[PDB]
Amino acid sequence: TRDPLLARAELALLSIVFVAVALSNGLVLAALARRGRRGHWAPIHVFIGHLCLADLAVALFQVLPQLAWKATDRFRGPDALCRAVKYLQMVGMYASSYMILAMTLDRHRAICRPVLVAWAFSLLLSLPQLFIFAQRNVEGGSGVTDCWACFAEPWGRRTYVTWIALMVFVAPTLGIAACQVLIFREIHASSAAVAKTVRMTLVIVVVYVLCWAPFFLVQLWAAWDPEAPLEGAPFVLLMLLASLNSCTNPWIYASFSSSVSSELRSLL
């Protein structure tokens, strides 16, 4: 039982991400059956759901490597030179948060191609960590060498791209903070519609904050870990969030406008 807890946790995460994929499929059937494809997504329909396409990409290209990197089977060394593999994984984390930032910018420009903009931000950030973490082989099977956890760059400079990542983290947090505060200020631009619109906007902001909190909490605990315990326990919560985002956005995003609920009732 080398990793029984890890195996069970990742299997549960597999299940939740798979159902997130199914929900994404319902979403793309909605986007097929309503309002047209993308001319350029300034108005309502065409923007929603491309986030969930990002979900599809991240979830599947995530379940692949995270499971497969225990190179006991189906691996004689990484097929894609251990670089393109985690490409998809971390462009997934990025692009997910980045198009949800894109929806922040939608709601902000409206109420106060962005996706390729986001993927652009993803690629340059994608280069370095795997460029040097196309890592020096460590023998996996006593004569078989695969890319195995070697570092020489990140401390060539100060604390590595993690702080950039968490600035990218905080940016949407304040983005949704801004959108909610400004819609709050807006309802009386110049009494039941106000008490209506307050609650669910607050719901969006709080669910956002709750969801990506585990990035912050695992980051702080893994700041507490390198000295004393050298543990990896809350990583279950970290990838639980890696789904949580990519999956609740399907279901919270169903929770707006009931368009997604009606489409699911229509077909799936």
Partner: peptide
Amino acid sequence: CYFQNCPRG
């Protein structure tokens, strides 16, 4: 097990 934040096994 992201950004090389993984235990072994």
